[PDB]
Amino acid sequence: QISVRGLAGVENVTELKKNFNRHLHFTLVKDRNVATPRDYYFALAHTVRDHLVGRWIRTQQHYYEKDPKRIYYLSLEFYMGRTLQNTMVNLALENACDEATYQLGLDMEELEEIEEDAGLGNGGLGRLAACFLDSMATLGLAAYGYGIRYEFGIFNQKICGGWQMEEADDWLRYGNPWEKARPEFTLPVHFYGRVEHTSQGAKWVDTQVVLAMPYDTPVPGYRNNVVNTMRLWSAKAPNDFNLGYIQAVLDRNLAENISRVLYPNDNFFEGKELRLKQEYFVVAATLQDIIRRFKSSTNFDAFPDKVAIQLNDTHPSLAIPELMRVLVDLERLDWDKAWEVTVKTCAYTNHTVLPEALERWPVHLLETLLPRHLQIIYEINQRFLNRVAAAFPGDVDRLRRMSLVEEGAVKRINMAHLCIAGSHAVNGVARIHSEILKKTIFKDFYELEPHKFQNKTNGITPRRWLVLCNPGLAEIIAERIGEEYISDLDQLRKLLSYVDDEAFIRDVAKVKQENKLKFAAYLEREYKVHINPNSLFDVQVKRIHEYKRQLLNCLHVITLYNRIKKEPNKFVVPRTVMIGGKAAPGYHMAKMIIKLITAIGDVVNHDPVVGDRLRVIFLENYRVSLAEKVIPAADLSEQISTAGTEASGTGNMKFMLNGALTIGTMDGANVEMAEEAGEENFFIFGMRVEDVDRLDQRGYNAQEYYDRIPELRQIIEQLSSGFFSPKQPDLFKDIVNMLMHHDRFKVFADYEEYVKCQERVSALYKNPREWTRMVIRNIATSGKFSSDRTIAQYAREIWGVEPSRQRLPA
Amino acid sequence: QISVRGLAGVENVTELKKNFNRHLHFTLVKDRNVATPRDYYFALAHTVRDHLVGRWIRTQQHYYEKDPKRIYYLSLEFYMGRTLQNTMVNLALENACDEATYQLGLDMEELEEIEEDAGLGNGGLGRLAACFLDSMATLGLAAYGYGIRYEFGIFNQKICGGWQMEEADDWLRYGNPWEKARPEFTLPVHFYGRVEHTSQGAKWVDTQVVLAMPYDTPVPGYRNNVVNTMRLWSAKAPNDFNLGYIQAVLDRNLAENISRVLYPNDNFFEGKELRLKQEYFVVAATLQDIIRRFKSSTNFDAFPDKVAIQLNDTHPSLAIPELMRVLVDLERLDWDKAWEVTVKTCAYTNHTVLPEALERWPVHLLETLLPRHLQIIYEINQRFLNRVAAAFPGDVDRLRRMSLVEEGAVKRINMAHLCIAGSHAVNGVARIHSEILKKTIFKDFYELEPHKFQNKTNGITPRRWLVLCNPGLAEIIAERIGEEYISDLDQLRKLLSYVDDEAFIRDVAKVKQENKLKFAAYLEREYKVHINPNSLFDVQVKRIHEYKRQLLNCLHVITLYNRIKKEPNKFVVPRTVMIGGKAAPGYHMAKMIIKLITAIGDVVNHDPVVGDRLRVIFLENYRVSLAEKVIPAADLSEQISTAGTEASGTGNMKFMLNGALTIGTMDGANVEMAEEAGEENFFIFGMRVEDVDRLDQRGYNAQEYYDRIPELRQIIEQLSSGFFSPKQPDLFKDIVNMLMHHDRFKVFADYEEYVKCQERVSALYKNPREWTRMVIRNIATSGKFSSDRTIAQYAREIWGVEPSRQRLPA
Ligand SMILES: OC[C@H]1O[C@@H](c2cc(O)c(Cl)cc2O)[C@H](O)[C@@H](O)[C@@H]1O
Ligand SMILES: OC[C@H]1O[C@@H](c2cc(O)c(Cl)cc2O)[C@H](O)[C@@H](O)[C@@H]1O
């Protein structure tokens, strides 16, 4: 149908059809009379998978022969989403499969909806890893993603009576056609035990053993015939485990619980033992696999020339002392040489400055679980602090500030400090974030080793986040400037010469309207809710957190409602306000915010005087597959975190690429986005980081704002009195109390500027032509935020490898 | 190479080779450079599996269109063994695959050894179910095997210091290519809860739900293109199970433990709750599936015309009250009508008379776990005892004897009594066993309903137990009489006209010698033990139990050793005595018997004076795949259970079919075997059932035998003093004490006759020609013991269906 979706040749369509029928018969053991729609999905998936394997085998063969430097990306999260469409896009198979399935009497889009999301991440950090894998394959790097194959991913969110309910994400229930179990590469991982010192070094003995079994998933590059590997470990008990008899067999579950479930916290540290076991499990298995592959190329001098290990946050920080353990205890290298290799091999990416998100493990936990690693950590600390002492003699407070060991009630290890000490590069994820790191939390470290600190602004893959989810927009762009931009997003700048082109303006606007109509229909079909497709689609989708300030959005929504009630017969630009996202199960305040949103909807959506001028919808079960639907449909993107709290954001970039305008604070990547597009083409409001600092020094008093803003006072009084909860008048007392007395994120301080800025948004929306022209100026300058750019910078500036756009033979 | 293994046509071999290469590439994602031998096995398995699916789909389609009466065989055990070779044999693919793999540079037998046994059974009962499935498919019956997909089958047995060690049988580790998950047919099973009585009957409420997910395995008939289904249920937690968050997800294991492990007891009742849950789980899921299939053909009058349910022992006895529950509570049939349907549908096979093996469940367990079923059981009992009271007025002791409810310390339900009451047919498994049932334990029931009681003598499949495991013998037989006997074993009688044929005599003897040489080499290659291939192979392989009297064998072995030590330079027929089998983990005495066997070996095998004249080997990890190796190699089959204890035996039939002579008591099927071959061609010794009864009435005193048999006295003195355990002199005190004071199985009483009979065996072995002639007379009369005969009798006399040897189209 559309050009960017590839060729549907006679030979190709015929071959796809026969292979579809072969899989239905031989693989699924079905015929057309008994086949379910799910059987049809699987037949398609296996057919597409067949096209991957040839390239997969030849890619890994190519790496064996050429022996390039290998990049190992270690993460506890890979938020992959669905694989079928992505695979078709990257292999240029989409139109051919669409035609083939149509001729078989099937609708491909319907089959695509059957695939479960691979939900092995929480949000931004997990999705970044997924975008990064796509870009590394597209840029021809010999890269491997290593993680855990969780049996249960992020929970499915149900809303019951306005409250979030969690249910297990049993994503493997029907099987996963994309993964290949590799039980032959099973590796042992050790826990507990004790340390013995001999004549020939230390020995870690009396350990409990858990097996790590790898499952490999292919990662196709964009039309370059490269297929890299994501290797995910699964926990298995050894066969003599606990070996009355029946109980011993049932107790195997204990060991296998390591890979059972993803911790559902985003930007929050929960110091539970099972989480620590997960972190060591991934690191121990991965490092053995790395070293095995290195030896099959004795002399570890060349190790950093052939291996790069990227630590995604501090979660795999144990890679540093584990590498030291292997090099010193097992390979018998001297400490100083081992340390040189480790530092040159490892690099660390920081993703947050929130104190509650920083990993600080109790010494007593590491003592029992990983006694040898604790010893190595102490030795690293001693040697590091000796360097600090020599550099800044007599500065005793610096020594205590920089220590890997934090003293106090319980002694803890600061994992971020470990990562900096043992890595040759430390990077933040947006320019403002990387500056904050050097100025505040890692200032001491920056002073000691300034060369270590870098910036790598985040990006998103234009394959999933434009071509896949928004083919209509990708097509009208390709009509003007060709197809090269899909792997070279800077080419979108060429669209600036079309900002006054009336044909293009109409097309951009048409694509958005189509996206909005399709999404409006989806809301009725799957959730029975009626919305006006001509209204402004005002959307905030992201994890529910206090710092992300969904509450500030709520205040604006109520302001709009109160203004309509005050002057009903006055014209207002109609809005559909959509908010979605999951709350961590134990995060009470975030759960209360969800309830508030639904409660506001309950009042607003049923007020006759409001009509179809204002609607508030909570988007249930926000996840990658839902993002692919709602983002192309959005008009306004809400990126309203308190300045200095959102390290980067990536949702922001997705909205920019898909034709939404942004209302946002000067936080994270918003700063660089506004810089690229021009501040006049962005809706910037609120405190800058410097203004937040000034308020903190003076002392933040929310009462001041309540006293001086009558509209804000009305809302707080409505919340307190039970306007949005008539049967439970005091339901939102915790929210009001927090807002009034202990708001770390200064919601009130940005309220006036936010509401004023929102008025400017509504004004522009009244003029469709000038709204669309500003949209074009955004899309056209979004090129910097391709993860291809991000990965190219990592490759050149951290890993020491050159990216390549050259094809491998088909 | 050999005729019975089928044709290796040019077209077939070429096609197999290309499909092998396709699976290696596309299915396994490997090439010839990285492929492991296990990859080669899987490529072969997938290639052979492809040939099954066409026939599988068309068989199940045929059943849908023709709507025949369906046979449901319910068992907690299916001891299937390996599937690859069996599939090739039944599809006539063995020579073609052998040729194809040879041309690819691979040895097929080596690949066959890679397959794990499907060890989902304990011994005789589990293996009978497997033989039965083969025969039902071969006889063209619309039959379904229903059971549990245990994650862990029978434990692997390791011998350490002469002691049995158990390790988990992780048989699914590498995947199972034969099964097909059918998550679309997932069914809920209910546990616990309580009963509510309404206006419209009883209701079972507040239950805990476990999901039952089916996995289907194909069962090919012998060259008739029929492929039936074995459906095995796997336990799954529902997604809202327990739905802090992490613990709730980890607790899903509790529900899923139902299908985790096979209880490793054979012929022994362990009244554990998890076992009861397994028994209900299989029954509840199966019956819903049965009824679903029946409704898709309202009126349950025709139910018994379209459905037969065979209960394999009492393990699935809950099918009776579960069918009543469904019919009465859910379908709203009146009691009397529901009961008529149930009785006409169900039939029960008894497999034991041992009191310790009979299932007697505590009322308090059923009360908590299955409250509605207990109520139904009481009502069944009340109505049944009313019939007994009317038939035998005033006989109050009969009422208490026949009750389904046993009074005492703890009230129990006798599951065997339930089965008789609720089945239209009750059968034993050998003529003597079925007579014992009518005369002793079920005498009261036989008097009330004589028509109910039948015999169905057990059998074994001649596919696995001759063609597959002994191709050399199958071939020399086919040369003389053709190939028809493989599905018509009575044709072996034609071999009687060859008993004086010198060519045939030499061939039979040659095949045995070849089998013995191959097995002697196996013992060195995989277990580093040296044996003399010219010695008599004296083998007892079966589960270790007191009733099977491995101890009587031990006494004979020591007698032979003591006789050699007394007269070293006297000639004795050389023997290799092989004993193998697993002991239940909690069965202390059986574990002590294994230790005794190894201890005897330790002394005997290292005595220089003995030389290669006597060897004692314990066959480690006895299982189906090992049976296929050792049985064709045997000269003498030990079937020496105390008369009246072995219900049938099936190992006995396997040895008879494969050219071993039998030393045995007149117990189980031994009686019918001796009858078929002629008593002169069998080595029969010891007490008959009547002699055991006379001894019990008088009182068994073992001291009498000790006092009057000096050779027996010497052995007991050797055991007591520590001759076979010099470092632990009292190691075997428990064994001596049991033998002397509390031997339920009268080992001493048969010792003299056993030793005397063994002398006659040695005498015959000295004359190879007359030994072989007797062998021919055994093989020739083994036809009755084909499971095709057994199943034909079940079909005609119990199920009311006609078997068919007619092909379905290829
Ligand atoms: O860098 C990817 C994303 O990581 C997010 C992020 C950082 C973390 O440290 C953890 Cl544990 C989870 C997470 O989603 C940041 O909040 C977001 O600003 C950033 O865009
Ligand atoms: O009928 C099959 C076999 O079942 C055996 C047998 C009977 C049982 O009741 C149980 Cl629980 C397990 C078992 O293996 C009998 O001991 C044997 O004599 C018979 O040949």
* B521 CB-near residues (< 8 Å, 6+ apart): none
CA distances from A526 to A167, A317, A535 (A): 19, 43, 20
Query: Cα(A456) to centroid of ligand 1, in Å?
Result: 14
Coil, helix or strand at residue A729 = coil
3-state DSSP assignment of residue A686:
coil
Residues of chain B neighbouring A585 (CB-CB closer than 8 A): 244-245
CA distance A508 to chain B (A): 43
C-alpha torsion sign, points B377, B382, B384, B385:
positive
Q: Is position A777 annotated in a ligand binding site? A: no
Ligand located closest to B130 CA: 2
Name the experimental technique. X-ray
DSSP of A276-307:
HHHHHHHHHHHHHHHHHHHHT---GGGHHHHE
Q: For chain B, how long is the longest CA-to-CA vector?
A: 90
Query: Tokens representing A738?
Result: 């927090």
Q: How big is chain A by its Cα radius of gyration, in Å?
A: 27
> What distances in angstroms separate CA A606 from CA A434, A578, B567, one per listed residue?
46, 16, 107
DSSP 3-state of A413: strand
Q: Which residue has the tokens 């049967």?
A: A727
* Chain A residues touching B587 at Cβ < 8 A: none
Separation between Cα atoms, residue A737 and residue B83, nearest integer Å: 69
Query: Measured in whole angstroms, how far is the alpha carbon of residue A700 from the centre of its chain?
Result: 32
If you measure CA to CA, which chain A residue comes closest to B167?
A240
A229 near A217, Cβ under 8 Å? yes
CB contact under 8 A, A26 and B585: no
Q: How far apart are CA B72 and CA B562, in angstroms?
A: 54
Whether B351 is catalytic: yes
CA of B179 to the centre of ligand 2 (A): 27
B617, B601 in Cβ contact below 8 A? Answer: yes
Q: Strand, helix or coil at B99?
A: helix
Please give the structure tokens belonging to residue A432: 């403002």
Contacts of residue A727, Cβ cutoff 8 Å, sequence gap at least 6 = none
Q: In angstroms, rounded to a whole number, what is the distance separating the alpha carbons of residues B636 and B631? A: 10
Residues of A in contact with B36 (CB under 8 A): 184
Asked whether the beta carbons of A658 and A469 are under 8 A apart, the reply is yes
CB distance from B183 to chain A under 8 Å?
A: yes
Cα(B641) to centroid of ligand 1, in Å? 71
B31 is in an annotated binding site: yes
At CB < 8 A and 24+ separation, what contacts does A37-41 make? A37/A110, A37/A111, A37/A114, A38/A114, A38/A174, A38/B184, A40/A106, A40/A111, A41/A84, A41/A111, A41/A112, A41/A114, A41/A115
Residue B637 to residues B642, B646, B676, Cα–Cα distance (Å): 16, 15, 17
- Evaluated on CA atoms A380, A386, A390, A394, the torsion sign reads positive
In DSSP terms, which residues pair with A156 in a beta bridge?
A: A167
d(CA B41, CA B614): 39
Residue A722 CA to residue B58 CA, distance in Å, equals 67
Rounded Cα–Cα distance for residues A764 and A415 (Å): 48
**At a CB cut-off of 8 Å and minimum separation 6, what does A122 contact?**
A77, A79, A154, A262, A264, A265, A266, A543
Helix (H) or strand (E) holding A707: helix A702-708
Listed resolution, Å? 2.0
Q: Which of B38, B174, B260 lies nearest to residue A249, judging by beta carbons? A: B260
| HEC per residue, B549-595 | CHHHHHHHHHHHHHHHHHCCCCCCCCEEEEEECCCCCCCHHHHHHHH
Q: How would you classify the pairing of strands B405-406 and B412-414?
A: antiparallel
Residue A473 exposure: Cα atoms within 13 Å on the Cβ side: 33
Residues of A in contact with B168 (CB under 8 A): 237, 239-241, 243, 249, 252
For tokens 């990708």, name the residue.
A474
Q: Which phi and psi angles does A348 have, rounded to 5°?
A: -130, 130
Is there a binding annotation on residue B293? Answer: yes
The Cα B746–Cα B239 span in angstroms is 56
CA dist., res. B623 & res. B82, Å (int): 11
> What residue in A sits closest to B253 (Cα-Cα)?
A253
B1-459+787-810: CATH topology is Rossmann fold (3.40.50)
CA–CA dist A413, A406 (Å, integer)? 6
> Do B504 and B542 meet the contact criterion of CB atoms below 8 Å apart?
no
What values do phi and psi take at B409, rounded to 5? -50, -65
Nearest to B432 by CA among B672, B641, B656: B672
Say what the alpha-carbon torsion angle A561, A563, A569, A570 is, to the nearest 10 degrees: -120
| Nearest-by-Cβ selection for B245 from A29, A237, A585 | A585
Helix/strand/coil (H/E/C) assignment for every residue in A509-556: HHHHHHHHHHHHHHHHHHHCCCCCCCCEEEEEECCCCCCCCHHHHHHH
| Break sites following residues in chain B (C–N > 2.5 A) | 243, 297
Minimal C-alpha gap between B243 and chain A (Å): 6
Amino acid at B395: D
Q: Report the side by side order of strands in the sheet with B536-541.
A: B614-619, B575-580, B536-541, B636-639, B661-664, B683-684
Strand partners, A309: A72, A346
* Cα distance between residue A754 and residue A734, in whole Å: 23
Q: Which residues contact B572 (CB under 8 A, 6 or more apart)?
A: B560, B563, B564, B613, B614, B762
Chain breaks in chain A (C to N over 2.5 A) after: 243, 297
Q: For residues B310 and B423, what is the distance between their CA atoms, to the nearest angstrom? A: 9
Q: What are phi and psi of B793, to 5 degrees?
A: -70, -45
- Which residues, 6 or more positions from B604, have their beta carbon under 8 angstroms from its beta carbon? B557, B561, B610, B614, B615, B616
Q: Which residues pair with A234 in a beta bridge?
A: A213
Annotate B291-330 with b (16+ C-beta within 10 A) or e (fewer).
bebeeeeeebeebbebbbbbbbbbbbbbbbbbbbbbbbbe
CB contact under 8 A, A240 and B167: yes
- Residues with Cβ within 8 Å of residue A623, at least 6 apart in sequence: A81, A117, A119, A154
Is the Cβ of B194 closer than 8 Å to some Cβ of chain A? no
Q: Which ligand is nearest to the CA of A130?
A: 1
The shortest CB-CB distance from B152 to any of A30, A249, A274 is to A249
CA distance A664 to A636: 10
Q: What is the 3-state secondary structure (H, E, C) of B48-75?
A: HHHHHHHHHHHHHHHHHHHCCCEEEEEC
Cα nearest neighbour of B172 on chain A: A183
Residue A622: phi and psi, rounded to 5, are -55, 130
Paired strand residues for A614:
A575
How far is it, in rounded angstroms, from Cα B310 to Cα B223? 26
The set of catalytic residues of A is: 351, 542-543, 548, 650, 654
Q: What is the DSSP letter of B691?
A: H
Supply φ then ψ for residue A156, to 5 degrees: -75, 135
* Residue A551 · residue A510 · CB < 8 Å: no
SS3 A323: helix
DSSP string computed for B701-757: -HHHHHHH-HHHHHHHHHHHHTTT-SSSTTTTHHHHHHHHH--TT-TGGGHHHHHHH
Q: Which of B686, B646, B650, B635 is nearest to B665 (CA)?
A: B686
**Which tokens is B315 given?**
């393990």
Task: Report the candidate in A354, A277, A78, A156 with the shortest Cα–Cα distance to residue B245.
Answer: A156
The SS3 of residue A730 is: coil
* Residue contact A274–B184, C-beta within 8 A: no
The dihedral sign for the CA sequence A370, A373, A379, A385: negative
Chain A residue nearest residue B28, CA to CA? A180
Spatial neighbors of B16 by CB under 8 A, at least 6 apart, are: B47, B93, B96, B97, B100
Does the annotation flag B485 for ligand binding? no
Spatial separation of the C-alpha atoms in residues B49 and B44, rounded to whole Å: 8
Nearest CB to A257; choose among B26, B54, B250:
B250
Q: Which of B328, B405, B168 is nearest to A241 (CA)?
A: B168
Q: Are A287 and A322 in contact (CB under 8 A)?
A: yes
Asked if residue A89 lies in contact with residue A42, where contact means CB atoms within 8 angstroms, the answer is no
b/e burial code for range A647-657 (CB count within 10 A of at least 16 → b): bbbbbbbbbbb
- Ligand 2 pocket, Cβ-based, cut-off 6 angstroms: B 122-125, 128, 266-267, 313, 351-352, 357, 429, 458, 646-650, 668
What is the separation of C-alpha A437 from the centre of its chain, rounded to a whole number of angstroms? 21
Nearest ligand by distance to the CA of A669: 1
Bridge partners (DSSP) listed for residue B637: B539, B662
Q: Note whether A211 and A240 are within 8 A (CB).
A: no
Task: Check if the beta carbon of residue B350 is closer than 8 Å to that of residue B428.
Answer: yes
Q: Is B56 on the interface with A (CB under 8 A)?
A: yes
What is the dihedral sign for C-alpha A111, A113, A119, A121?
A: positive
Which among A651, A185, A366 has a CA at the least distance from the CA of B34?
Answer: A185
Question: What six digits make up the tokens of B261?
Answer: 């492990």
Instruction: Please state, in angstroms and rounded to a whole number, the distance separating the CA atoms of residues A44 and A33.
Output: 17
Please answer yes or no on whether A243 and B167 come within 8 Å at the CB atom: yes
Residues framing ligand 1 (Cβ under 6 A): A 122-125, 128, 266-267, 313, 351-352, 357, 429, 458, 646-650, 668
Q: Which residues contact B435 (CB under 8 A, 6 or more apart)?
A: B428, B455
Q: How many CA atoms lie within 13 A of B220 on its CB side?
A: 27
Cβ proximity of B190 and B238 under 8 Å = no
How far apart are alpha carbons B797 and B795 in whole angstroms?
Answer: 6
- Output the DSSP codes for A79-110: EEE--HHHHHHHHT-HHHHHHHHHHTT--HHH
**A-chain residues near B29 (CB < 8 A):** 53, 56-57, 180
Cα A434 to Cα B142: distance, rounded to the nearest angstrom:
71
Q: Are B190 and B204 in contact (CB under 8 A)?
A: yes
Probe ligand 2: pick from B267, B353, B456, max atoms within 8 Å of CB? B267
| 3-state SS, residue A682 | coil
- How would DSSP label each residue in A265-278? -SS-----HHHHHH
Is A706 marked as binding a ligand?
Answer: no
Residue B596's Cβ-side half-sphere holds a number of Cα atoms within 13 Å equal to: 28
Residue with tokens 């809706």: A683
Residues B5, B6, B8, B14: is their CA dihedral positive or negative?
A: negative
If you search the block for the tokens 């995604």, which residue do you land on? Answer: A312
Question: B632-654 burial by CB neighbour count: b if 16+ within 10 A, else e?
Answer: bbbbbbbbbbbbbbbbbbbbbbb
User: Mutate which of B75, B313, B351 to test ligand 2's pocket (most atoms within 8 Å of Cβ)?
Assistant: B351
Q: Which one, of B131, B74, B73, B157, lies nearest residue B648 by Cα?
A: B131
**For chain A, what is the largest distance between any 2 Cα atoms, rounded to a whole number of angstroms?**
90
**Residues near B528 by Cβ (< 8 Å), separated by ≥ 6?**
none
- Which residues are CB-contacts of A491 (< 8 A; sequence separation ≥ 6)? A481, A482, A484, A485, A783
Kindly determine whether residue A241 and residue B38, on different chains, have CB atoms separated by under 8 Å: no
Question: Facing residues of B540 across strands?
Answer: B579
A7 CB-side CA count, 13 A: 5
> φ, ψ for residue A553 (rounded to 5)?
-60, -50
- The DSSP secondary-structure symbol of B469 reads T
First to last CA, chain B: 25
Strands B163-167 and B156-160: antiparallel
In the 8-state DSSP scheme, what is residue B460?
Answer: B
Task: Give distance in angstroms: CA of B351 to centre of ligand 2.
Answer: 5
Of A26, A241, A245, the CB nearest to B264: A245
Q: What is the DSSP letter of B803?
A: -
Residues of B in contact with A26 (CB under 8 A): 50, 53
The minimum-distance atom of ligand 1 relative to the CA of A313 is 9
In this structure, whether the domain defined by A460-786 belongs to CATH 1.10.10.60 is answered with: no
| CATH 3.40.50.2000 domain locations along chain A | 1-459+787-810, 460-786
The helix/strand/coil state of B361 is strand
CA dist A327 and A456 (Å) reads 30
Cβ contact A617:A520 at 8 Å: no
What Rg, from alpha-carbon coordinates, does chain B have? 27
Type of residue found at B425: A
Residue that the structure tokens 């700063």 belong to: A671
